Design a protein around this nucleic acid. Structure first.
Ligand SMILES: [Zn+2]
Lengths: 84, 49, 49, 49, 97, 49, 49
RNA sequence: AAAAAAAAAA
DNA sequence: TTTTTTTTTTTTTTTTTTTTTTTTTTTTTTTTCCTTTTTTTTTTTTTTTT
DNA sequence: AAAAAAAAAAAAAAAAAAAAAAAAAAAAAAAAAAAAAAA
């Protein structure tokens, strides 16, 4: 049940529950020796690198938001806009 | 303490971890660091094989 | 949780009570018990006419 | 006797029925006594491990 | 302890009665020292003082618990307060104030 | 006395309240639904904030 | 780490904290955290996960 | 090692 | 000789009583005591007799 | 010196208060069917 990109009705803003699991999954990926999409300035804790490449929206995660009628909308990271 | 036992992650802890909206902390404290197990299940009957 | 947490604090006004009206009214947590349980017989039914 | 033994294997707390007499002066702890309760298998071992 | 001695003396008389009825139906006599089982009174008082369940050992579920307690030896005042304690038989679950 | 008697029914009321509403969640369409998907509120708190 | 006082009444009764390793043997927390935990520092025991 | 009881702490 | 009118017999509800059943805050720390028992049957032993 | 009866040791056995929902029994009015009187 792939909803088209023009027909997405969910919010365009990443809430805290998406942010926590995206940061955790990306930190686990960097800790398991994935390539780092951005430059480095001496950060060693991979959760800091996870925020650092979340600022430039360079994280390859597709969030599959589930509507209550068991349909899903796929949103990229760069399609969402950070707020804190 | 005398039997070297862990802490009781009771019902109210589960309640307020639901209230925090943290699914992974609940899955950790209630499946990962308490009693994980793997079972083999028949697809047709759904029972332990 | 945000409705059950004030129920623990519904005993601080127990003292310094004398009563001005002689009207039967259930107050505090048992009155809460009358509204959560939907009691078909309340302890103090009253009409405000 | 067979019906009594089967039922008190399953359920030991039903009124009107003779209690399953364990050796040490206690009733039998049946499957229902394992599951039902605050310290049972649901509340004390699954919601609260 | 008087009530405990009533129960244990009744059990002793029942056991003595059963022994002498077993040995009277065969036409023989009996010995009084072999008739009295001395473990009954001693074992009953020892059990009901060590355990605290105030009654028969087989029927301890109908008996009151916590009548006999281990004496608290932490301070002298704790021992004096434990020796001068009064317990109400109302259970510790009553909503009535 | 008032601090002891109550605390039991207050905790029982809290457990009942948390068990009646443990799966009510704001969904991605803004509506508020329970575990079975039954609609409760079209917006959370009637304003979605 | 996750820091928890029992009984758990609301959401802020178990919260996240950062470990600072200190010399003696008690879990030393700040004073402004006494209000959400309902701690009293009179022999209160408290849990860490 | 289990079960029960009692005394307590917040 | 048929129609109305009284009687009967179910029929469904009502209402009150009785019975049943299920429930009783969260966590933590120490001891003590028991985890058989008398009864009945079976087997071995000891003494006595021819 | 061999065979039988009674006594003692060893082994298995059974013996609290509250509140809501459901079931039940006496009652009670209502409605349809059957029997009798009259025109
Ligand atoms: Zn199968």
């Amino acid at each position: 049940g792939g909803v088209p990109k023009s027909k997405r009705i969910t919010t365009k803003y990443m809430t805290k529950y998406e942010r926590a699991r995206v940061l955790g999954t990306r930190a686990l990926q960097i800790a398991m020796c994935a390539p780092i999409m951005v430059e480095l300035d001496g950060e060693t804790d991979p959760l800091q690198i996870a925020m650092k490449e979340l600022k430039q929206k360079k994280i390859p995660i597709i969030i599959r938001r589930y509507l209550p009628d068991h349909s899903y909308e796929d949103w990229s990271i760069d399609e969402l806009i950070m707020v804190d | 303490r005398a039997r070297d036992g862990g802490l009781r992650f009771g019902e109210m802890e589960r309640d307020c971890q639901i209230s925090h909206g943290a699914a992974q902390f609940l899955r950790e404290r209630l499946f990962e660091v308490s009693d994980p197990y793997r079972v083999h299940i028949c697809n047709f009957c759904g029972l332990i094989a | 949780q945000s409705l059950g947490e004030p129920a623990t604090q519904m005993t601080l006004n127990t003292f310094h009570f004398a009563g001005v009206s002689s009207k039967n009214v259930t107050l505090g947590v048992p009155r809460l018990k009358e509204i959560i349980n939907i009691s078909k017989k309340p302890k103090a039914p009253s009409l405000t006419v | 006797m067979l019906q009594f033994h089967v039922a008190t294997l399953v359920d030991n707390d039903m009124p009107g029925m003779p209690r399953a007499m364990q050796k040490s002066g206690k009733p039998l702890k049946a499957i229902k006594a394992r599951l039902k309760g605050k310290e049972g298998r649901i509340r004390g071992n699954l919601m609260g491990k | 302890l008087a009530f405990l001695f009533r129960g244990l003396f009744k059990n002793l008389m029942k056991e003595v009665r059963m022994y002498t009825q077993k040995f009277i139906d065969r036409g023989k006599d009996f010995n009084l020292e072999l008739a009295i089982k001395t473990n009954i009174i001693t074992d009953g008082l020892r059990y009901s003082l060590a355990t605290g369940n105030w009654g028969d050992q087989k029927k301890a579920h109908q008996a009151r618990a916590g009548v006999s307690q281990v004496l608290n030896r932490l301070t002298f005042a704790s021992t004096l307060s434990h020796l001068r304690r009064v317990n109400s038989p109302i259970g510790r679950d009553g909503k009535l104030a | 006395i008032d601090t002891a008697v109550k605390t039991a029914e207050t905790g029982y009321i809290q457990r009942r309240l948390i068990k009646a509403m443990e799966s009510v969640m704001v969904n991605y369409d803004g509506t508020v639904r329970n575990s079975v998907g039954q609609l409760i509120q079209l917006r959370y708190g009637e304003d979605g904030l | 780490v996750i820091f928890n006082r029992q009984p758990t009444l609301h959401k802020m009764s178990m919260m996240g904290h950062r470990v600072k390793v200190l010399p003696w043997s008690t879990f030393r927390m700040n004073l402004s955290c006494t209000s959400p935990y309902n701690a009293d520092f009179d022999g209160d025991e408290m849990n860490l996960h």
